[PDB]
Design an enzyme around this catalytic site. Structure first.
Site, short mmCIF file in Angstrom:
data_model
loop_
_atom_site.label_atom_id
_atom_site.label_comp_id
_atom_site.label_asym_id
_atom_site.label_seq_id
_atom_site.Cartn_x
_atom_site.Cartn_y
_atom_site.Cartn_z
N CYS A 1 0.64 -1.25 -0.02
CA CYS A 1 0.09 0.32 -0.46
C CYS A 1 0.85 1.19 0.40
O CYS A 1 2.15 1.22 0.70
CB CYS A 1 -1.10 -0.08 0.87
N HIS A 2 1.01 2.07 -1.27
CA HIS A 2 1.64 3.20 -0.94
C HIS A 2 0.95 5.04 -0.08
O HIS A 2 0.77 5.94 -0.91
CB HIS A 2 1.40 3.78 -2.58
N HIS B 1 -2.81 1.87 6.72
CA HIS B 1 -3.62 2.97 6.85
C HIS B 1 -3.94 3.38 8.75
O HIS B 1 -4.21 4.25 8.57
CB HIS B 1 -5.10 2.68 6.63
N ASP C 1 -3.48 7.89 4.79
CA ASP C 1 -4.97 7.83 4.95
C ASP C 1 -5.47 7.15 6.66
O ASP C 1 -6.23 6.87 7.07
CB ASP C 1 -5.87 5.79 4.06
#
Ligand SMILES: NC(=O)c1ccc[n+]([C@@H]2O[C@H](COP(=O)([O-])OP(=O)(O)OC[C@H]3O[C@@H](n4cnc5c(N)ncnc54)[C@H](O)[C@@H]3O)[C@@H](O)[C@H]2O)c1
Ligand SMILES: NC(=O)c1ccc[n+]([C@@H]2O[C@H](COP(=O)([O-])OP(=O)(O)OC[C@H]3O[C@@H](n4cnc5c(N)ncnc54)[C@H](O)[C@@H]3O)[C@@H](O)[C@H]2O)c1
Lengths: 471, 471
Positions: A183-184, A212, A269
Site C-alpha cells: 500500500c502506498h 492505513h 489514509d
C-alpha cells in the site's frame, strides 16, 4: 529460466498499465525472458488491458512478453511473483466490485449507520472492508494461497486488494504462504516537507504502524527534531489551509488535531481513520477536512466511483480505437495514462527488481512485526520500513518508538478489530458480526443490528455470503 | 515483636466489623500481640466502629488490642498489613463517598449518558470508577504507597477500594509498593454448582481473568468436562429462572447468553459487565436480568445506597446504645451483624494468616500476570488463582487457557480501557478524558462530551479535581 509475473485482476486497467509500464522501463526486468501473465474473470476488461498493454510496451520498445489468460491456475502455475489486485463481484448483478460496497452502504444508512456498517472508528476508509468479514476478498486470497503452495512454492504473493491488513494476516497465519501487503499511503509525507519549505532529501524521516494507521515517528532536520517546524506551521498557516480536492487531507485540521493528541503526525489514509470526532455527519466532516468534507462521504464517494466507472468504459473504448487505428501512438495521444521515461512511484516493481536482481531498496511493507515494535506480538502484520534485496525483507529498527498514546488509543484497538474480523470469517458465525456491531457507537438496539445484517445478507448478490453464515 | 494490622477507612463499619470478627476468631491471630489500628477521617463513624469492635471482641473473648487513630501516618508507621477500604469524600458537601458518584451520574444522565459517564461497555458496575480517572481514590492509594515505602517497607498493601484493577496496576507500576488487589466475586461459582445439583467439594474448578472480568475456565466432575450439565440446565431450567433480589444474576439469561458466545461462564460481577446488549435501558435490563433489571439501574441503585446509608446511621446509634447499656450482648441482640463461631468468607484474613503464620490457602487475588496467561504482558495486573504461604504468592497454572473470544472481545478491550484511565490520571489532561468519551457508544457529538465534563468538573465538591486538570 524465464521470469513469470502474474497480475490477478488485470482488468483494473490503469493499475495494470502502470505495473506493465514500470517493468518495461526497468532496465533489468525489461527482458525477452520476462513474462507478464494478465489474468481476470471479466473478459471485456481483460481484452482491453491486454491490447493496451501490448501497444504500450511496443512503443517503449520493451521486448517483454505479455500473455492474457482466463484461468487462475494457468496464471499461478510456476509464477515467481503474483500480484493480487482483484476486486471480486457477481456479473449477474454487478459490473464492478465497488457497486456491491456502494449498495450495502445504502442498506446500512437505511438502518441508521452513516457511511455504512463498514465505516468503523479507526477505519473510515471507503471500500476497505465488506460487511466486516470481507468474505469475497478473503476467500479469493486464501484460494490463491492454497493454489500457489502446490504450483508456485517459491513465489511472493503481493497483496494489493483490501483489506490488506486483515487479508495479509489471515493468509500468513492460516496458510504458510509467502504473502506481503502493499500500500502506498507513505507518499503523503512528501507534502508535509514541501509545505514546511524543506528539501525532501535533506530530511531524516521514518514512519511505522499498521496499514492505513502509520505515524511519522521520526522527523529530523540537521540532526534535530523538526517537529517545532510543524508546531509553527499550525500556528501561522493552518488557519488559511484549504484542500485542492477531496483527497487532500494531510495538512487538514483533523490531521493537526490528531497530531496534538498523539504527539506524532498521522500519514496518508491514517488521517481518514480518526475517531468519530471528525465524522459524525457531512457538516462535521467539512469543519475538519475542508469544503469537500474529505472523500469518505455521501457526495464525494459516489461521485468518485462514477468517475472510476466512466474511466473503465473509456479505456475499453480506447482499446477498440488501437484495434481500429494501428498507427496512432498512445504515448503521444494520452501521455497522462501512458508515461514514457517516468515511473509510477508504486513499490511493486522496485520490490520485484530487488528480490529478483538484488537492486536493494527501502520500502514500506506489511510484514509480521517479529519484534520490531516490542509492545506487540511477533506474529501481527504491520506496515514497517524495510530494506529489500535478493536475501528478502530486512526490517529497519524503529526509532524513536511510537508514543504510548498511539499504542493504547490507536494501534491496539485497530489490531483487535482485525482479530474480530478474522474470527467472524473463520468461525462462520453471525454472532461475531453481531458482537462487532454491538460495540459500534451508532447501534441503538440489538434489533437494529439483526435487521441490518438480515437485509445485507438477503441482497441477491450476497447469496453465497449468507450460505457461508448459514446455521 | 507485635503484629500491626491497619484498617484505613474503618468507618465502613460492617466491613471493618467482619474483619475484626475474622481475626478475633482465627486461633493464630487472636493474640495479645495482635494490634488492630482503625483509622478514618470521619470521627462519628470511627468512634462507632471502635466502640462496637471493642465490645465485639470482648464477647468473643479475644485478647486482641484495638487502637483508633485519626492520622494515617500513625496507622501506617511500622504496619505489617494495611487494608485500604477508604471511599474518599468532601465533608463540607457530602457525608459518604457514594453521594458524589450518585451526583455525577445524575449530571451524566442530564447530558444523555444513561447510568452516568462511568458506566462503560465491559464495566457497568456501579461506583467502580469516578469520572473515569478515579482521582480521589487513586490519589489516596498513591499517598498511602509513598508513605509506606518510608515507614512500613515490609508491609502488604491490601487494596479493597475501587477501582481495584486500575489502582493496583498504577501503584504497582508507578511506585515500588507491595500492593495486592482483593475482591470476592469468585463466590458466585458456588451457586452454579448448587443449581446443577453438584456437591461443591466434588467439583474440580478454576477461574481467571481480570477484576470483575473472571471466567470459569475449568469446570469438571469425575475428571470430565461438566459444561454439558450447564447446557442441559439452559435448556430445561432457564425458562423459569427468576432472581431472588437485584444482585441475583449468576444464572440469568444475560449470563447464559455470554456463556453461549464466549464458551465459558462469566462469574460474579463479570455478569454485570457485559456489552451494551443487556443495558440499553431499564426495559432491556429487565429482559436479561429479571424483574429488578439487576442492581445497576435508576431504581435499584439509589434504593441500595439509601439502605446502606440507613444502616450506617443505625450502627452509629447502636454504638450510643452499648455506651448507654454496658451489659447487653451484641452476639445475642444482633447475631446477623456480630456472628460467633463463623467466618466472613472474605479472603483478607486468610491472606494475613497465610503470610504471617504459614497457614497456606488458595485465594483469588489481583497480582501481576508474570506470564500466567501467555497472550498478555507480564506486568498487567489480573485476578488469578494463587496459593499463599509465608514465602508469599505463588500462581497456579491456568488450564485450560481462556478462549480466543474472551481474550480478543473481553479481556484485551478491558485492559486497554484501564490503560486509558491511567493515562488520563498521569497526564492530567482533559483531552484524554474527551478521547475516552469519543469512543463511548452514547456520545452524539463532541460538544456533548465537553459539556458533560465541564458540568461534572464544576460541581463544588470537585474543586480539587478540576484544579488537577487545569491547563
Ligand atoms: N486498491 C484496492 O485494489 C483492488 C482493485 O481495485 P480497482 O479500483 O482496481 O477495482 P477494479 O474493478 O477496477 O479492478 C478489479 C478487477 O479484478 C477483477 N476480478 C474480480 N474477481 C476476480 C477474480 N476472481 N479473479 C481475477 N480477477 C478478478 C475484476 O474483473 C476487475 O477487473 C481493490 O480491492 C481496492 O480496494
Ligand atoms: N467495595 C469498595 O470498598 C470501598 C468502601 O466502600 P463502603 O461501602 O464501605 O463505603 P463507606 O462510606 O461505608 O466507607 C468508606 C469509609 O472510608 C472513610 N474515608 C474516606 N476518606 C478517607 C481517608 N482519607 N482516610 C481514611 N478514611 C477515609 C469514610 O469516612 C468512610 O467511613 C469503596 O471504594 C467500594 O467501592
Amino acid at each position: 529460466h524465464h521470469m513469470k509475473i502474474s497480475i490477478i485482476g488485470a482488468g483494473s486497467v490503469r493499475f495494470a498499465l502502470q505495473l506493465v509500464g514500470d517493468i518495461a522501463q526497468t532496465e533489468e526486468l525489461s527482458r525477452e525472458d520476462t513474462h507478464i501473465y494478465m489474468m481476470d474473470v471479466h473478459e471485456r476488461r481483460l481484452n482491453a488491458s491486454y491490447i493496451l498493454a501490448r501497444k504500450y510496451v511496443e512503443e517503449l520498445n520493451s521486448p517483454v512478453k505479455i500473455v492474457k489468460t482466463s484461468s487462475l491456475d494457468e496464471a499461478i502455475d510456476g509464477a515467481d511473483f503474483i500480484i493480487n489486485t482483484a476486486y471480486p463481484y457477481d456479473p449477474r448483478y454487478h459490473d464492478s466490485g465497488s457497486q456491491r460496497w456502494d449498495e450495502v452502504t445504502k442498506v446500512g444508512e437505511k438502518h441508521g449507520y452513516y457511511r455504512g456498517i463498514d465505516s468503523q472508528e479507526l477505519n473510515m476508509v471507503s471500500t476497505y472492508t465488506y460487511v466486516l468479514s470481507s468474505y469475497p476478498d478473503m476467500k479469493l486470497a486464501l484460494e490463491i494461497a492454497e493454489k500457489m503452495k502446490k504450483m508456485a512454492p517459491k513465489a511472493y504473493l503481493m497483496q494489493t486488494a483490501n483489506p490488506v491488513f486483515e487479508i495479509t494476516q489471515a493468509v500468513r497465519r492460516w496458510t504458510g504462504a509467502n504473502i506481503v501487503g502493499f500500500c502506498h499511503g507513505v507518499a503523503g509525507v512528501y507534502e508535509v516537507f514541501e509545505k514546511l519549505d524543506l528539501d525532501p532529501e535533506e530530511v531524516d524521516w521514518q514512519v511505522a504502524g499498521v496499514n492505513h494507521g502509520i505515524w511519522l515517528n521520526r522527523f529530523r532536520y540537521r540532526g534535530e527534531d523538526a517537529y517545532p517546524l510543524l508546531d509553527e506551521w499550525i500556528e501561522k498557516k493552518l488557519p488559511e489551509w484549504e484542500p485542492k480536492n477531496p483527497w487532500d487531507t494531510q495538512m487538514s485540521p483533523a490531521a493537526m488535531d490528531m497530531y496534538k493528541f498523539y504527539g506524532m503526525l498521522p500519514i496518508g489514509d491514517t488521517v481518514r481513520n480518526g475517531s468519530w470526532k471528525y465524522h459524525y455527519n457531512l457538516e462535521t466532516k467539512k469543519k475538519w477536512f475542508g469544503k469537500f468534507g474529505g472523500i469518505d462521504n455521501e457526495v464525494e464517494r459516489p461521485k468518485f466511483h462514477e468517475q472510476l466507472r466512466r474511466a473503465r468504459e473509456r479505456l475499453i473504448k480506447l482499446a477498440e480505437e488501437v484495434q481500429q487505428n494501428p498507427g496512432m501512438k498512445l504515448t503521444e495521444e494520452h501521455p497522462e495514462i501512458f508515461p514514457k521515461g517516468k515511473l509510477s512511484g508504486e513499490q511493486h516493481i522496485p520490490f520485484i527488481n530487488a528480490i529478483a536482481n538484488n537492486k536493494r531498496v527501502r520500502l514500506f511493507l506489511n510484514v509480521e512485526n517479529q519484534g520490531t515494535l516490542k509492545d506487540f506480538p511477533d506474529d501481527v502484520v504491520m506496515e514497517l520500513p524495510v530494506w529489500v534485496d535478493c536475501c528478502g525483507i530486512h526490517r529497519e529498527k524503529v526509532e524513536p518508538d511510537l508514543t504510548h498514546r498511539i499504542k493504547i488509543f490507536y494501534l491496539w484497538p485497530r489490531i483487535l478489530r482485525m482479530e474480530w474480523n478474522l474470527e467472524a470469517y473463520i468461525s462462520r458465525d453471525r454472532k461475531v458480526l453481531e458482537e462487532i456491531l454491538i460495540r459500534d457507537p451508532r447501534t441503538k438496539s440489538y434489533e437494529q443490528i439483526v435487521q441490518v445484517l438480515d437485509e445485507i445478507f438477503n441482497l441477491p448478490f450476497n447469496e453465497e455470503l449468507r450460505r457461508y453464515y448459514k446455521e
